[PDB]
Amino acid sequence: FTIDSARGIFPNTLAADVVPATIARFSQLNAEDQLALIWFAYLEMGKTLTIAAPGAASMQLAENALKEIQAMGPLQQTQAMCDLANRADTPLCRTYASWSPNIKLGFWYRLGELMEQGFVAPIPAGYQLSANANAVLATIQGLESGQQITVLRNAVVDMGFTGKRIAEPVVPPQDTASRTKVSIEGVTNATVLNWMDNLNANDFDTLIELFTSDGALQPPFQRPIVGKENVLRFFREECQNLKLIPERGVTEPDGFTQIKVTGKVQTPWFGGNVGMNIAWRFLLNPEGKIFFVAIDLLASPKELL
Ligand SMILES: CC1=C(/C=C/C(C)=C/C=C/C(C)=C/C=C/C=C(C)/C=C/C=C(C)/C=C/C2=C(C)C(=O)CCC2(C)C)C(C)(C)CCC1
Ligand SMILES: N[C@@H](Cc1c[nH]c[nH+]1)C(=O)O
Ligand SMILES: [Cl-]
């Protein structure tokens, strides 16, 4: 067993690989087309999906960069936003690259508000997308909401130029007395239940003790994150205030055990308004420690167990 071979457990699991496909197509576009396409997607999605305000700490961390753009003339504002999309080497692009996903998302949330209000240079009136860009937007608009928000997040994360790391403060774990316990049809495995419950409580120090020293976590469409230091950093930087709603699973006992669970996850960016269809694929060692866990965004609800 290696981490890279563990990636192959439960090969029937059909991931929503239209998400990375669509990001690859998006990545080819002209920068002005990239910005305009996301503006159109975001405006249309906002007719039915309510996005949460960025956290106060996040907005403080992004404040100096946002102020710099706000002080620019309109041509320079457009150029700064194009620099980010083009992954140009500029001071702003390097600052942006140092930020956690949530800080990048909050930065663009604020620019979108300012563009709507007309205080930052908007997408030009009457703007027409390129041939390739129109088709990329059509693909996004045909996706389930959970896939759409994953495309937007990955587009945002990929901008800027790459190192110092800036992230939001780590919230205290949920008080013991108020914590929920999940139930999973077919799965009583204590490691899997404790995984779900500790993540739901933001209890990352308890969560990390479930792993082997060489264990890995593979987020959707990302390479495995290997070892307790890197996995705990990922938890603290990117995994706060999720709600995991596992539904059902299957347990296949080497003394190792493979377990697959399907259900839904909510991000604090959308709360109950977007339920992403998710699989968890666990490979546990004989002592019950996590050697490998993958989290997959599923192609459709038809992929739930
Ligand atoms: C750019 C841009 C603009 C603004 C864009 C904005 C503002 C977009 C905002 C998008 C947002 C806010 C998206 C949020 C997505 C969040 C997601 C998709 C979260 C998924 C999390 C998952 C699936 C976690 C699962 C996990 C589980 C379950 C585990 O068990 C272990 C941990 C982990 C793996 C993490 C404007 C309009 C100005 C136009 C110009 C360009
Ligand atoms: N950073 C943690 C590491 C840890 C080990 N187990 C749980 N957490 C600590 O200071 O203790
Ligand atoms: Cl999130």
Author numbering: 3 to 164, 169 to 259, 262 to 313
The article reads:
Upon photoactivation, OCP converts into the physiologically active red state (OCPR) via the formation of numerous intermediates, and the quantum yield of OCPR formation is extremely low (about 0.2%). These effects are of particular interest for the chromophores embedded in OCP since the only specific carotenoid-protein interactions in the OCPO state are two short and strong hydrogen bonds between the 4-keto oxygen of the carotenoid and two hydrogens in the CTD, one belonging to the Tyr-201 hydroxyl group and another to the N-H group of Trp-288 (numbering corresponds to the OCP sequence of Synechocystis sp. PCC 6803).
It crystallized at three different pH values in the same space group P3221, giving three structures with resolutions from 1.37 Å (pH 6.5) to 1.49 Å (pH 5.5). The electron density for the residue 201 reveals two alternative conformations of the engineered Trp in this position with nearly identical occupancies, nicely supported at this high level of spatial resolution. One Trp-201 conformation has the nitrogen oriented towards the keto group of the carotenoid (‘IN’ conformation), presumably enabling the formation of a weaker hydrogen bond with a distance of 3.2 Å.
